[PDB]
Amino acid sequence: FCGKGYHLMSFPQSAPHGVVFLHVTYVPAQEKNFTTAPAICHDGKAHFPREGVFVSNGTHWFVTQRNFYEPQIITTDNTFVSGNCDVVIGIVNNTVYDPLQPELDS
Amino acid sequence: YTMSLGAENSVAYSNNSIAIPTNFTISVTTEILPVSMTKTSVDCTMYICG
Amino acid sequence: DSTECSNLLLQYGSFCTQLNRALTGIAVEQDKNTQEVFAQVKQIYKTPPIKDFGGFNFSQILPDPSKPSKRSPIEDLLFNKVTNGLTVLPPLLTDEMIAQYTSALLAGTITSGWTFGAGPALQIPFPMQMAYRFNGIGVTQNVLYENQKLIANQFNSAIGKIQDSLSSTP
Ligand SMILES: *[C@@H]1O[C@H](CO)[C@@H](O[C@@H]2O[C@H](CO)[C@@H](O)[C@H](O)[C@H]2NC(C)=O)[C@H](O)[C@H]1NC(C)=O
Ligand SMILES: *[C@@H]1O[C@H](CO)[C@@H](O[C@@H]2O[C@H](CO)[C@@H](O)[C@H](O)[C@H]2NC(C)=O)[C@H](O)[C@H]1NC(C)=O
Ligand SMILES: *[C@@H]1O[C@H](CO)[C@@H](O[C@@H]2O[C@H](CO)[C@@H](O)[C@H](O)[C@H]2NC(C)=O)[C@H](O)[C@H]1NC(C)=O
Ligand SMILES: *[C@@H]1O[C@H](CO)[C@@H](O[C@@H]2O[C@H](CO)[C@@H](O)[C@H](O)[C@H]2NC(C)=O)[C@H](O)[C@H]1NC(C)=O
Ligand SMILES: *[C@@H]1O[C@H](CO)[C@@H](O[C@@H]2O[C@H](CO)[C@@H](O)[C@H](O)[C@H]2NC(C)=O)[C@H](O)[C@H]1NC(C)=O
Ligand SMILES: *[C@@H]1O[C@H](CO)[C@@H](O)[C@H](O)[C@H]1NC(C)=O
Helix, strand or coil: CCCCCEEEEEEEEEECCEEEEEEEEEEEEEEEEEEEECCEEECCEEEEECCCEEEECCCCEEEECCCCCCCECCECCCEEECCCCCCCCCCEECCCECCCHHHHHC | CCCCCCEEEECCCCCCEEEEEEEEEEEEEEEEEECCCCCCCCCHHHHHHC | CCHHHHHHHHHHCCHHHHHHHHHHHHHHHHHHHHHHHHCCCCEEEECCCCCCCCCCCCCCCCCCCCCCCCCCHHHHHHHHHCCCCCCCCCCCCCHHHHHHHHHHHHHHHHHCCCHHHHCCCCCCCHHHHHHHHHHHCCCCHHHHHHCHHHHHHHHHHHHHHHHHHHHHCC
8 A cells, every 4th residue: 555565654746637656665674484383382382472473593492573584582471371382283393591590590 | 470478487396396586686667657648629519519 | 430520529629549548558557557456576485385384274274286287286276266449458466476486475474474574584483483373462472482383283274264265265
């Protein structure tokens, strides 16, 4: 409706008997392949991303936002737990880091 | 010639692979929309008969 | 072919030119309408040869290779259910190319989500695309993943009911 791509903002310009809209939009570029999974199996529990998506560069699993590649460590703060690992089709095994773990470790 | 609808592009679909963008382009596009016309009035008596 | 009639018709001026120009405008407007509706992608996408979409069946909407017209069964049913100076101009886009455009749109929305409409087509698994759509309507991803078989069965049943309802209603 407001240009091709993900619309950010627009500018109006007067024209003889008309209007010209300059649509400023966000276009994704330089995409890269990653190996993805619906959920992460850890401690007999299924972890799902709160807002992002699980990606793998070949050996390590990360969670990133869907529209830009920004890999972050899979923790309990960016994932939520629902059910065990027996129901979700395609769940993979990976560790889930806990930020609280070094606090009681020390 | 018979027209080509578009350049062929086969998306590499598989059940466990995703494509994530690593960059972006800020694209500005133009959209021209007419708003009004010339306001014309015709004197019917003068036009037909003068 | 009456020359006296045309000689008398020339007294009325450019009425015929106005009528021809209006009809020409309508005729190009129809092609513009088809261009705006169907030609919204400049890449012709195709589905993979293996139709593994996590239990989701799209055979009723994907093109049938057995048919020479390359139409879907639903599109084939839709085409079956529709039955002095005059000329009929052919449409600029044939039915085969409009079917090809719909096939490209279906392949893009199945294999790439909504990414192809906003930029380059980024591949994503279909049970993940569905989960994204679930998150769009405010339902958590887990609900989709846990009940993926039931949702796929319901979707296939609904698509079959659509074909049956179109085939059974005049
Ligand atoms: C996937 O990304 C991870 C994290 O960026 C990579 O792990 C790093 O690999 C480099 C190269 O040997 C090491 O120096 C770093 O110490 C590693 N970091 C961690 C946290 O282990 C991993 O190698 C990448 N895999 C591929 C196939 O590119
Ligand atoms: C992911 O981890 C689970 C849990 O350890 C693995 O499930 C085990 O699979 C072995 C091999 O068949 C069985 O003998 C165990 O009894 C299973 N344990 C449970 C709790 O189900 C699963 O195989 C692992 N997946 C991968 C790909 O390594
Ligand atoms: C992600 O991986 C796929 C599979 O290797 C890549 O798709 C191939 O791209 C080459 C380059 O033109 C084609 O010749 C192959 O036919 C493609 N394979 C299939 C199955 O279509 C894809 O290009 C990769 N994506 C990125 C961004 O590198
Ligand atoms: C993202 O794309 C931008 C292009 O808009 C890249 O910026 C260019 O980077 C090259 C490499 O140093 C420079 O020579 C160009 O002058 C840059 N262009 C502009 C407009 O700044 C940017 O590097 C890309 N980033 C990544 C991570 O790929
Ligand atoms: C997808 O749906 C199609 C049609 O609903 C299935 O095709 C049917 O398969 C059965 C079993 O072989 C046949 O008896 C029917 O005649 C087929 N219908 C048609 C219209 O051809 C297909 O099996 C489903 N699954 C897959 C994986 O394609
Ligand atoms: C993807 O398909 C392969 C078979 O080609 C299967 O072994 C694998 O488990 C599937 N993965 C998912 C996540 O469905």
